[PDB]
């Protein structure tokens, strides 16, 4: 059964609620983004209206085979009427096609559902600036002050400078980047751009990337692995055994691997600066874990919420333990006392 924090009161709507069968009273199912924990349950046999971004709808049609007649893509930053209710989709600064959803309830209440997001000051000048928000359904993934990480721009600077140095020292080094979902494409695109290469990958991953409206993509990616010196592999293969095996397959073209695992946060964040990050090495294989996050840090989250000043917060992540829920509620009260709302 669908949990309460996936239901929008006063509407027929649910958010990211496709794994619960037919939800009683639901007339439209919203999907914030194409990540499996959120789409879990969709397929070609789904016959209710799904509302989403254009990019999300391209992925639904081509990857999950949802039929066209049931996909309802909406433009961003544009007031739309859904089953008698005004809605707006806003960029969530998460993965491609990810949105936040503003619902203007018939009784005057305004609700923001962040989906998954990485809060940014740029959001303070969207259509959120223009009215009061009563209830916030919040992505609380990193809601504790231990969760610090650098800007995406610092992490990409580190990756490009590391890759360019290695391959200029050794023109026979291969670069490998791990992936298992959409998101974090800047990692492998920025490294291939500094090296003058396309990114090589499996047909299934190429297909996924071609759904993303990324400009000039035909210029940046390929399925011809032999023509590329940046390869994409499943995240599970980014270990010494899987990388040794891959290097065998390249037929003596290369004699070294430099590999990247974009994680979110890891506890090596609480001690070390990005500048000081070092790889794990075994023979001619080195693996870097880089803290490229598509979720808010603690400080980014706190700034957003103190700017928005909601009347009520509903967490959507870390809700399964009493200790997590009590921690989050304590921070929400701090933020409200400090800011004065
Ligand atoms: Ni996500």
Nearest to 63 by CA among 182, 236, 227: 182
Q: Rounded to an integer, what distance in angstroms lies between the CA atom of residue 209 and that of residue 336?
A: 41
Q: Rounded to an integer, what distance in angstroms lies between the CA atom of residue 305 and that of residue 295?
A: 14
CATH superfamily of 1-147+296-341: Ribonuclease Z/Hydroxyacylglutathione hydrolase-like (3.60.15.10)
Distance 64 CA to ligand 1 centre (A): 17
Fold of the domain built from segment(s) 148-295: Rossmann fold (3.40.50)
Q: This structure's resolution (angstroms)?
A: 1.4
| Identical fold between 1-147+296-341 and 148-295 | no
Q: Give the three-state DSSP class for 26.
A: coil
Distance 269 CA to ligand 1 centre (A): 21
Domain-by-domain residue ranges, the chain? 1-147+296-341, 148-295
How many other C-beta atoms lie within 10 A of the C-beta of residue 225?
Answer: 17
| Torsion angle in degrees (nearest 10) through CA of 23, 27, 30, 35 | 40
Q: Rounded to an integer, what distance in angstroms lies between the CA atom of residue 99 and that of residue 93?
A: 8
Distance 53 CA to ligand 1 centre (A): 14
Q: Give the three-state DSSP class for 205.
A: helix
Q: Rounded to an integer, what distance in angstroms lies between the CA atom of residue 333 and that of residue 339?
A: 10
Distance 36 CA to ligand 1 centre (A): 8
Distance 216 CA to ligand 1 centre (A): 25
Residues paired with 290 in a beta bridge: 262
Burial class (CB in 10 A: 0-12, 13-18, 19+), 221: buried
């Amino acid at each position: 059964t669908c949990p309460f924090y996936k239901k929008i009161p006063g509407t027929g709507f649910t958010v990211d609620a496709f794994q619960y069968g037919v939800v009683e009273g639901c007339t439209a199912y919203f999907l914030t983004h194409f990540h499996s924990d959120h789409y879990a349950g969709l397929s070609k046999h789904f016959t209710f209206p799904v509302y989403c971004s254009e990019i999300t709808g391209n992925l639904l049609k081509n990857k999950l085979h949802v039929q066209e007649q049931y996909i309802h893509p909406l433009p961003l930053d544009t007031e739309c009427i859904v089953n008698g209710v005004k809605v707006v989709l806003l960029d969530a600064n998460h993965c491609p096609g990810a949105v936040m959803i503003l619902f203007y309830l018939p009784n005057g209440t305004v609700i923001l559902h962040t989906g998954d997001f990485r809060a940014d000051p740029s959001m303070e000048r969207s259509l959120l600036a223009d009215q009061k928000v009563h209830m916030l359904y919040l992505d609380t993934t990193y809601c504790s002050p231990e969760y610090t990480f650098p800007s995406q721009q610092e992490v990409i600077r580190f990756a490009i400078n590391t890759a360019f140095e290695a391959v200029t020292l050794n023109p026979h080094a291969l670069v490998v980047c791990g992936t298992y979902s959409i998101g974090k494409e800047k990692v492998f695109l920025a490294i291939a751009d500094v090296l003058g290469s396309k990114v090589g990958m499996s047909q299934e991953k190429y297909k996924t990337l071609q759904c993303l409206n990324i400009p000039e993509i035909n210029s940046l990616i390929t399925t011809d692995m032999c023509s590329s010196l940046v390869h994409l592999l499943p995240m599970m293969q980014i270990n010494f055994k899987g990388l040794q095996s891959h290097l065998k397959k390249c037929g003596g073209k290369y004699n070294q691997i430099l590999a990247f695992r974009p994680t979110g946060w890891t506890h090596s964040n609480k001690f070390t600066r990005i500048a000081d990050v070092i790889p794990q090495t075994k023979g001619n294989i080195s693996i870097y874990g880089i803290p490229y996050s598509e979720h808010s840090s603690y400080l980014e989250m706190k700034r957003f919420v103190q700017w928005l000043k909601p009347q009520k917060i509903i967490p959507t992540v870390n809700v399964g333990t009493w200790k997590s829920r009590s921690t989050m509620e304590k921070y929400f009260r701090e933020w409200k006392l400090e800011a004065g709302y």
